[PDB]
Amino acid sequence: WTATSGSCKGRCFELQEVGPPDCRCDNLCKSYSSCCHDFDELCLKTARGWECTKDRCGEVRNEENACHCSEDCLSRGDCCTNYQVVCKGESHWVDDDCEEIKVPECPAGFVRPPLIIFSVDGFRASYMKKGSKVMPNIEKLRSCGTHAPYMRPVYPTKTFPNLYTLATGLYPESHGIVGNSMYDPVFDASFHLRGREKFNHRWWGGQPLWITATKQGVRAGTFFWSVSIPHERRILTILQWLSLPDNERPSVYAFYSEQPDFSGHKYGPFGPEMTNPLREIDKTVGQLMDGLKQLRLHRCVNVIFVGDHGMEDVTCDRTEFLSNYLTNVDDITLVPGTLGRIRAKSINNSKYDPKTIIAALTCKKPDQHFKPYMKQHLPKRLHYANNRRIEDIHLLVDRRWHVARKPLDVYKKCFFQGDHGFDNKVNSMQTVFVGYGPTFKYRTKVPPFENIELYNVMCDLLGLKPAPNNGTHGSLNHLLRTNTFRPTMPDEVSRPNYPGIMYLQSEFDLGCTCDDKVENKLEELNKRLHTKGSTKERHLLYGRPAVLYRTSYDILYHTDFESGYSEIFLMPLWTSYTISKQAEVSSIPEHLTNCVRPDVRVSPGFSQNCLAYKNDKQMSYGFLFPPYLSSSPEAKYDAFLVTNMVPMYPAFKRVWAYFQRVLVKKYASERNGVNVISGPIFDYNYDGLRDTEDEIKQYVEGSSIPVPTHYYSIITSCLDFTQPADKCDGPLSVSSFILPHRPDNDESCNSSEDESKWVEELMKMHTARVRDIEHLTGLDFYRKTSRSYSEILTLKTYLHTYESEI
Ligand SMILES: *[C@@H]1O[C@H](CO)[C@@H](O[C@@H]2O[C@H](CO)[C@@H](O[C@@H]3O[C@H](CO[C@H]4O[C@H](CO[C@H]5O[C@H](CO)[C@@H](O)[C@H](O)[C@@H]5O)[C@@H](O)[C@H](O[C@H]5O[C@H](CO)[C@@H](O)[C@H](O)[C@@H]5O[C@H]5O[C@H](CO)[C@@H](O)[C@H](O)[C@@H]5O)[C@@H]4O)[C@@H](O)[C@H](O[C@H]4O[C@H](CO)[C@@H](O)[C@H](O)[C@@H]4O[C@H]4O[C@H](CO)[C@@H](O)[C@H](O)[C@@H]4O)[C@@H]3O)[C@H](O)[C@H]2NC(C)=O)[C@H](O)[C@H]1NC(C)=O
Ligand SMILES: N#Cc1cc(Cl)cc(COC(=O)N2C[C@@H]3CN(C(=O)c4ccc5[nH]nnc5c4)C[C@@H]3C2)c1
Ligand SMILES: [Ca+2]
Ligand code: NA
Ligand code: NA
Ligand SMILES: [Zn+2]
């Protein structure tokens, strides 16, 4: 019950949402239906429209009008946005030349430049170029300010997951808004787009920017706007808030446009009908900026123009049906569309089997336009698993397609030509970022970045301390003229041991053999030098990785590679090596095919053993530093050391061998040398963070050798590829991946073909940021370069996406 008998008199768009059953006057009461009886009459005035005309100039104040053109309207903070233009011979903001804003030019009583977040739904990154002719205000913001060619959303690329990521700097898995429809089994409750469950606080985790602001004494405008409040009114409200007294006036504000998403769904992203929504958005921008200029705030406020996601061509005819794959379709519940999530229809049916559902959906038709995954097997770059609202079975749908349970769900539940929600690497899902204002750079382009990073920067812009989030604070300092955040590198927690020769070969009883007893002060002073670290400057180019947790490990040097060898996990945490453009691939000599050699620097009790592999019929082994890339026949023996071995399913050894025998050399040829760091990852609880030893669910049978869930590689080179990787004077270039360590290649539908037709495509799918590998290993990379730490942070957040050029 809301006793709506109170009144909005003097309270229109009041900033504290007062508790029931007193009636409300805030920008959300319509959506809750709790507004006072007189909310429309007093707060949603429309009379005379939104623009001054010549005849209203000077007019006598009439409180009925939507906005005013009377002499006192500036004092009142409620002029029409074009008042000064029509009535006082001023220019529109867009017609003025841009002039660098080197310092904030703020009215008296402003303690900090306000932040206005101008968010647009469904604003595809390519609109900036393709719509440029009809968006002059936006184009001015973009060219005069700081802009990225695009900004990457999170997955799933739906509205609420992305807006609330923008507000919290968290992945959906962590904030808890994981889709537009959700079931939470603990609450036993469902969340939906239409309805009232979605207004319950328990859905929404983290700390959004308006709460961060409030808890630190910065006031905030209310971020949300009911759909029936017109855009003009939203802008006038913001500008009226900006006229409040100092102690009552917010520092941060948001506007939201439901366009161009609304039209995009109906017409497609580039439908002829899409010109007018772009024009209308631009006009709204124009109203804000003319309004700010009237208040003398246009060289004071920092404006961010930001989208939530793009929009792709999707029609009813490109639907796949689960009824064409499964016979028991009535026993499942599907969350459908541009992604799928499947769970059992009833918890009391113990005949439902996830394994057989996945098998029925795997590679069943030649052109199949979705791929099923257990959530923990999704690409790690999606960070889409650690939440109980994410069902175990997920379908990743190809761009331009839908998935549905049965045809009747699509014809009785075509209406639409656009949609979004797909993999956040897809070009059509990318969206926009422009920053304009005293705190942003002038006429600067920056590289694409992910939306998880913007919370930190908004916090910076407002003088706030960010709550703990998934951005990397400092990676976006290059967007800012001032207020940078100057982070320090984390402290190394564990120092390495540097073992020398300590064990005789007969101490080892590992069941390992090698044909290596076929043996000179010349080249034996030489191998002693390689074992003390003499080639290490060539193979460890950016310092040793720091270990950021408590553990016991050894640095091992060799001619061709350096490793950090964990005595706890019995294998390297990391292995580092450099492959020049000139390096040659060699094969594994026949007599060395099964060679494994004890490492006399490491005790038997801290070594793997060959017998465990012999007795584990499921599990084989691989090497981190590849024997194929050995610099010499004699150096090759180092690669067969038991301290360079790692457990690998035979099916995974197909991928890994191709990476090591063919791809590495191809990259070194293309990039003018590469530095490679590779290692294992253990993430059995799928939280994106390094497991402790007591979380490992699988060991090589009979042993304490833990089986990795993933293998990584970080591949670094010179951004200026006319310089070789090992003699680079400036910025670096990186690509990385996090390959799932699976006992089958069911993910790859073409895996019975030659590796040259499928392996690299798998690796592309599992592209990763260095930061993602950091979380997964407790390691910190690039500790010693000649670059600024901020530039390194940016390199660590880079994702190589392998899409074509937008
Ligand atoms: C991306 O960034 C995020 C944010 O930094 C990273 O996520 C963080 O990761 C930490 C490790 O996984 C995790 O620490 C947890 O915290 C547990 C307490 O959590 C509750 O309180 C949180 C704090 O709120 C307050 O925050 C500020 C200060 O920062 C205060 O001033 C305010 O007053 C705030 O109220 C809160 O954030 C958290 O929210 C989650 O849960 C809510 C529902 O309960 C959701 O609404 C919300 O969306 C969050 O949901 C996500 O996270 C949970 C895990 O918390 C997960 O279940 C969901 O799937 C979803 O992903 C909570 O309300 C604390 O209890 C944990 O401690 C245990 O572990 C330590 C290990 O050292 C033990 O020593 C200790 O004994 C304890 O063990 C006991 O429990 C075990 C397991 O239950 C049990 O086995 C054992 O035997 C013991 O009984 C731990 O510290 C942060 O909570 C988490 N934050 C968020 C927001 O998600 C994330 O990792 C990043 N991702 C990547 C890839 O880097
Ligand atoms: N997060 C975030 C965020 C980040 C940025 Cl950058 C911009 C914005 C501006 O978004 C809005 O104006 N929106 C208005 C639309 C309709 N709507 C609701 O009615 C609603 C939804 C959740 C609620 N929880 N509690 N009340 C709620 C009301 C939500 C939609 C989005 C939000
Ligand atoms: Ca983990
Ligand atoms: Na052998
Ligand atoms: Na396959
Ligand atoms: Zn939409």
Tab-separated table of C-alpha atoms in Angstrom, residues 499-698:
chain	number	residue	atom	x	y	z
A	499	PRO	CA	69.826	-24.727	-6.100
A	500	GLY	CA	73.105	-26.030	-7.368
A	501	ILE	CA	74.046	-29.657	-8.037
A	502	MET	CA	73.081	-31.560	-4.904
A	503	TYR	CA	71.980	-35.073	-5.808
A	504	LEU	CA	73.625	-38.024	-7.530
A	505	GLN	CA	71.697	-39.744	-10.332
A	506	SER	CA	71.456	-43.016	-8.373
A	507	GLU	CA	69.476	-41.313	-5.629
A	508	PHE	CA	66.520	-41.075	-7.918
A	509	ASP	CA	64.084	-43.952	-8.273
A	510	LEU	CA	61.515	-42.350	-10.559
A	511	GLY	CA	61.155	-45.158	-13.132
A	512	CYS	CA	62.522	-42.747	-15.735
A	513	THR	CA	65.066	-43.664	-18.387
A	514	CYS	CA	66.948	-41.778	-20.988
A	515	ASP	CA	69.501	-42.788	-23.625
A	516	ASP	CA	71.893	-40.003	-22.594
A	517	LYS	CA	75.150	-41.760	-21.466
A	518	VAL	CA	77.138	-40.699	-24.569
A	519	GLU	CA	79.428	-37.811	-23.466
A	520	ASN	CA	86.743	-30.917	-22.403
A	521	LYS	CA	87.326	-27.628	-20.492
A	522	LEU	CA	86.106	-25.779	-23.657
A	523	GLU	CA	82.377	-26.684	-23.608
A	524	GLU	CA	82.083	-27.729	-19.895
A	525	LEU	CA	83.036	-24.349	-18.381
A	526	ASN	CA	80.339	-23.372	-20.882
A	527	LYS	CA	77.482	-25.553	-19.537
A	528	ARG	CA	78.372	-24.557	-15.906
A	529	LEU	CA	77.864	-20.903	-17.033
A	530	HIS	CA	74.404	-21.801	-18.533
A	531	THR	CA	73.361	-23.515	-15.248
A	532	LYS	CA	74.346	-20.333	-13.220
A	533	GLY	CA	72.226	-18.021	-15.465
A	534	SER	CA	74.565	-16.753	-18.284
A	535	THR	CA	72.001	-16.777	-21.101
A	536	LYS	CA	69.241	-15.625	-18.691
A	537	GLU	CA	69.163	-12.039	-20.116
A	538	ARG	CA	68.152	-13.521	-23.439
A	539	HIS	CA	65.404	-15.868	-22.099
A	540	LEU	CA	64.069	-13.760	-19.187
A	541	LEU	CA	63.424	-10.374	-20.786
A	542	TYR	CA	61.139	-8.571	-18.299
A	543	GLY	CA	62.533	-9.807	-14.966
A	544	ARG	CA	61.469	-12.904	-13.060
A	545	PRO	CA	57.703	-13.024	-12.396
A	546	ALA	CA	56.942	-12.194	-8.778
A	547	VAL	CA	55.266	-14.901	-6.659
A	548	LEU	CA	52.538	-13.101	-4.666
A	549	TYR	CA	51.669	-15.849	-2.235
A	550	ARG	CA	53.557	-18.029	0.266
A	551	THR	CA	55.185	-21.085	-1.284
A	552	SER	CA	58.510	-22.880	-1.866
A	553	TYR	CA	60.078	-22.696	-5.313
A	554	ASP	CA	63.429	-22.835	-7.156
A	555	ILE	CA	64.777	-20.841	-10.055
A	556	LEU	CA	66.367	-23.253	-12.609
A	557	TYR	CA	68.583	-21.952	-15.342
A	558	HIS	CA	69.364	-23.626	-18.658
A	559	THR	CA	70.892	-22.741	-22.006
A	560	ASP	CA	67.535	-22.252	-23.750
A	561	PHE	CA	65.074	-21.466	-20.927
A	562	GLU	CA	64.574	-20.405	-17.278
A	563	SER	CA	61.920	-21.787	-14.960
A	564	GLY	CA	60.395	-21.211	-11.514
A	565	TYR	CA	59.972	-24.758	-10.200
A	566	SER	CA	57.345	-25.324	-7.448
A	567	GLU	CA	58.400	-27.887	-4.865
A	568	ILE	CA	54.734	-27.995	-3.746
A	569	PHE	CA	53.092	-28.708	-7.097
A	570	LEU	CA	56.147	-30.612	-8.484
A	571	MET	CA	56.301	-28.637	-11.730
A	572	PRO	CA	57.051	-25.130	-12.950
A	573	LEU	CA	54.811	-22.225	-12.113
A	574	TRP	CA	56.344	-20.581	-15.184
A	575	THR	CA	58.909	-21.314	-17.869
A	576	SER	CA	60.421	-18.459	-19.893
A	577	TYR	CA	62.246	-18.647	-23.244
A	578	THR	CA	63.067	-16.473	-26.238
A	579	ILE	CA	62.780	-17.704	-29.901
A	580	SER	CA	64.389	-15.412	-32.447
A	581	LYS	CA	63.179	-14.940	-36.008
A	582	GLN	CA	66.168	-16.995	-37.192
A	583	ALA	CA	65.633	-19.962	-34.796
A	584	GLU	CA	65.195	-23.371	-36.405
A	585	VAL	CA	62.709	-26.145	-35.474
A	586	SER	CA	64.283	-29.576	-35.029
A	587	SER	CA	62.587	-32.880	-34.296
A	588	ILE	CA	62.789	-35.143	-31.316
A	589	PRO	CA	65.508	-37.705	-32.177
A	590	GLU	CA	64.189	-41.256	-32.187
A	591	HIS	CA	66.347	-42.536	-29.307
A	592	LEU	CA	65.042	-39.638	-27.068
A	593	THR	CA	61.277	-40.128	-27.687
A	594	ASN	CA	60.613	-41.384	-24.107
A	595	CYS	CA	63.661	-39.771	-22.446
A	596	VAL	CA	63.094	-38.211	-18.978
A	597	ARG	CA	66.203	-37.250	-16.974
A	598	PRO	CA	66.450	-36.598	-13.210
A	599	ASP	CA	67.323	-32.994	-12.344
A	600	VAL	CA	70.317	-33.201	-9.957
A	601	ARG	CA	69.451	-29.729	-8.535
A	602	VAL	CA	66.084	-30.915	-7.114
A	603	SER	CA	65.502	-33.667	-4.562
A	604	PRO	CA	63.841	-36.983	-5.597
A	605	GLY	CA	61.081	-36.226	-3.079
A	606	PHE	CA	60.277	-32.917	-4.883
A	607	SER	CA	60.261	-34.522	-8.372
A	608	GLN	CA	57.624	-36.151	-10.498
A	609	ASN	CA	58.170	-39.827	-11.406
A	610	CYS	CA	57.629	-41.646	-14.660
A	611	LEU	CA	55.982	-44.635	-13.082
A	612	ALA	CA	52.886	-42.688	-12.069
A	613	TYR	CA	52.413	-41.795	-15.751
A	614	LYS	CA	52.996	-45.414	-16.785
A	615	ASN	CA	50.339	-46.640	-14.354
A	616	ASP	CA	47.813	-43.804	-15.199
A	617	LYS	CA	46.301	-45.006	-18.414
A	618	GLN	CA	44.356	-41.742	-18.948
A	619	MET	CA	47.318	-39.356	-18.436
A	620	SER	CA	50.461	-38.648	-20.461
A	621	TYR	CA	53.056	-35.818	-20.095
A	622	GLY	CA	54.367	-32.864	-22.101
A	623	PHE	CA	57.159	-30.349	-21.632
A	624	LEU	CA	56.864	-26.664	-21.034
A	625	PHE	CA	60.003	-25.677	-22.877
A	626	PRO	CA	59.625	-27.500	-26.157
A	627	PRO	CA	62.400	-29.955	-27.211
A	628	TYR	CA	61.726	-28.850	-30.831
A	629	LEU	CA	63.204	-25.431	-30.171
A	630	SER	CA	66.454	-26.523	-28.591
A	631	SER	CA	69.379	-24.405	-29.686
A	632	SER	CA	71.690	-27.425	-30.163
A	633	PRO	CA	71.737	-31.244	-29.888
A	634	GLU	CA	73.442	-30.970	-26.516
A	635	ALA	CA	71.038	-28.276	-25.169
A	636	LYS	CA	68.166	-30.534	-26.147
A	637	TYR	CA	68.881	-32.846	-23.198
A	638	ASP	CA	67.837	-30.022	-20.801
A	639	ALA	CA	64.354	-30.105	-22.282
A	640	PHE	CA	63.909	-33.702	-21.152
A	641	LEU	CA	64.528	-32.871	-17.498
A	642	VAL	CA	61.894	-34.146	-15.121
A	643	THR	CA	61.607	-30.525	-13.863
A	644	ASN	CA	60.328	-29.415	-17.325
A	645	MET	CA	57.552	-32.036	-17.476
A	646	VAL	CA	53.838	-31.463	-16.917
A	647	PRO	CA	50.869	-33.791	-17.027
A	648	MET	CA	48.890	-33.734	-20.276
A	649	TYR	CA	45.970	-35.783	-21.523
A	650	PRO	CA	46.828	-37.340	-24.908
A	651	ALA	CA	44.041	-35.369	-26.578
A	652	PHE	CA	45.532	-32.147	-25.163
A	653	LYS	CA	49.019	-33.232	-26.308
A	654	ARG	CA	47.800	-32.934	-29.864
A	655	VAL	CA	47.078	-29.195	-29.332
A	656	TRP	CA	50.188	-28.499	-27.246
A	657	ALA	CA	52.582	-30.255	-29.678
A	658	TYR	CA	51.235	-28.305	-32.572
A	659	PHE	CA	51.511	-25.010	-30.633
A	660	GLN	CA	55.122	-25.848	-29.731
A	661	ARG	CA	56.336	-27.431	-33.048
A	662	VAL	CA	54.554	-25.121	-35.517
A	663	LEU	CA	52.982	-21.980	-33.943
A	664	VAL	CA	55.722	-20.646	-31.794
A	665	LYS	CA	58.098	-20.544	-34.749
A	666	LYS	CA	55.394	-18.961	-36.941
A	667	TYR	CA	54.939	-16.234	-34.342
A	668	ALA	CA	58.671	-15.597	-34.076
A	669	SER	CA	58.826	-15.242	-37.897
A	670	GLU	CA	55.884	-12.809	-37.988
A	671	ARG	CA	56.733	-10.735	-34.878
A	672	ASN	CA	60.546	-10.668	-35.319
A	673	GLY	CA	61.225	-12.961	-32.359
A	674	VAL	CA	59.006	-13.774	-29.329
A	675	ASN	CA	59.468	-14.269	-25.616
A	676	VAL	CA	57.227	-17.071	-24.336
A	677	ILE	CA	56.199	-17.692	-20.722
A	678	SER	CA	54.148	-20.819	-20.284
A	679	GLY	CA	52.816	-22.683	-17.298
A	680	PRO	CA	50.048	-24.575	-15.696
A	681	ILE	CA	46.814	-23.196	-14.079
A	682	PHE	CA	44.704	-24.886	-11.424
A	683	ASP	CA	41.184	-23.480	-11.120
A	684	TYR	CA	39.010	-26.392	-10.015
A	685	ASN	CA	36.387	-24.085	-8.301
A	686	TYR	CA	36.098	-21.928	-11.449
A	687	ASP	CA	36.460	-18.613	-9.509
A	688	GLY	CA	39.189	-17.255	-11.858
A	689	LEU	CA	41.709	-17.264	-8.955
A	690	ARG	CA	44.708	-19.548	-8.257
A	691	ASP	CA	43.782	-22.703	-6.351
A	692	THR	CA	45.472	-23.698	-3.146
A	693	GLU	CA	46.741	-27.314	-3.058
A	694	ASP	CA	43.771	-28.509	-0.994
A	695	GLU	CA	41.384	-27.432	-3.811
A	696	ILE	CA	42.858	-29.805	-6.454
A	697	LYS	CA	40.370	-32.419	-7.510
A	698	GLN	CA	42.574	-34.641	-9.682
